[PDB]
Design a protein around this ligand. Structure first.
Ligand SMILES: O=C(c1cc2ccc(C3CC3)cc2[nH]1)N1CCCc2cnccc2C1
Ligand SMILES: [Ca+2]
Ligand SMILES: [Ca+2]
Ligand SMILES: [Ca+2]
Ligand SMILES: [Zn+2]
Ligand SMILES: [Zn+2]
Length: 230
């Protein structure tokens, strides 16, 4: 992919081109670029500059930034005890390490929400967790190694609330090689609770993958959850 081709594909996939179409301005790259620079808190130049190309090459969440599909209901949970089922496993980590990475991701949200997170072994879990490559049965295919790492669905029935992790990625704890399953799952679980992307670079719900050894929640994430659950 050229830089220009990557830019066009990034703008399309994350919903920038569609919003530029709604504003009569999808004939040239500039307007969609300004939308993206605003959404990602980059300098608002309207140019495919070094900061914008660096942003677009950065591994990130598969969930769109402007918009979503249409889903059922008001996109928040209406019960306190959120259940999750680990449907399958990456071979990249031991099963106990994967289970713990998901438990820890949920423990992060549990402290700042009136919700509890309980593991089940059942199809009826609120949050079904699945590892998948390319087309993995929801019509929202992954893209092979790097680029988008995962996605998740807002609260509701069936696929809603589920979290999928791209197993063309190497899953680790983010040290040496591979992406931290803990940090990606913490981000995806935010979506599964009803949160959208943050435009604050340091927030967990910022769409780009950023490795840290520090506590990953920011004021913006805690406040996001507060504006959802009473
Ligand atoms: O559109 C979504 C999608 C995720 C999501 C997360 C949170 C929320 C708000 C917080 C309540 C809405 C969401 N929509 N899809 C699920 C994510 C995958 C995807 C990828 N590209 C285009 C469309 C879709 C469909
Ligand atoms: Ca579900
Ligand atoms: Ca990928
Ligand atoms: Ca893998
Ligand atoms: Zn995301
Ligand atoms: Zn999926």
């Amino acid at each position: 992919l050229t830089d220009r081709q990557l830019a066009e594909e990034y703008l399309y996939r994350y919903g920038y081109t569609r919003v530029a179409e709604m504003r009569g301005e999808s004939k040239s790259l500039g307007p969609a670029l300004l939308l993206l620079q605003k959404q990602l808190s980059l300098p608002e130049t309207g140019e495919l500059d070094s900061a914008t190309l660096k942003a677009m090459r950065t591994p990130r969440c598969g969930v769109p930034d402007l918009g979503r599909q249409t889903f059922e209901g008001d996109l928040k949970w209406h019960h306190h005890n959120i259940t999750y089922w680990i449907q399958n496993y990456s071979e990249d980590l031991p099963r106990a390490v994967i289970d713990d990475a998901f438990a820890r991701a949920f423990a992060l949200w549990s402290a700042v929400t009136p919700l509890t997170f309980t593991r089940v072994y059942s199809r009826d879990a609120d949050i079904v967790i699945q590892f998948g490559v390319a087309e993995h049965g929801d019509g929202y295919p992954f893209d092979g190694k790097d680029g988008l790492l995962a996605h998740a669905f807002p609260p509701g029935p069936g696929i809603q609330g589920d979290a999928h992790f791209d197993d063309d990625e190497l899953w680790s704890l983010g040290k040496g090689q591979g992406y931290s399953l803990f940090l990606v799952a913490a981000h995806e679980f935010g979506h599964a609770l009803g949160l959208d992307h943050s435009s604050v670079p340091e927030a967990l719900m910022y769409p780009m993958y950023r490795f840290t050894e520090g506590p990953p929640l920011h004021k913006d994430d805690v406040n996001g959850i507060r504006h959802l659950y009473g």
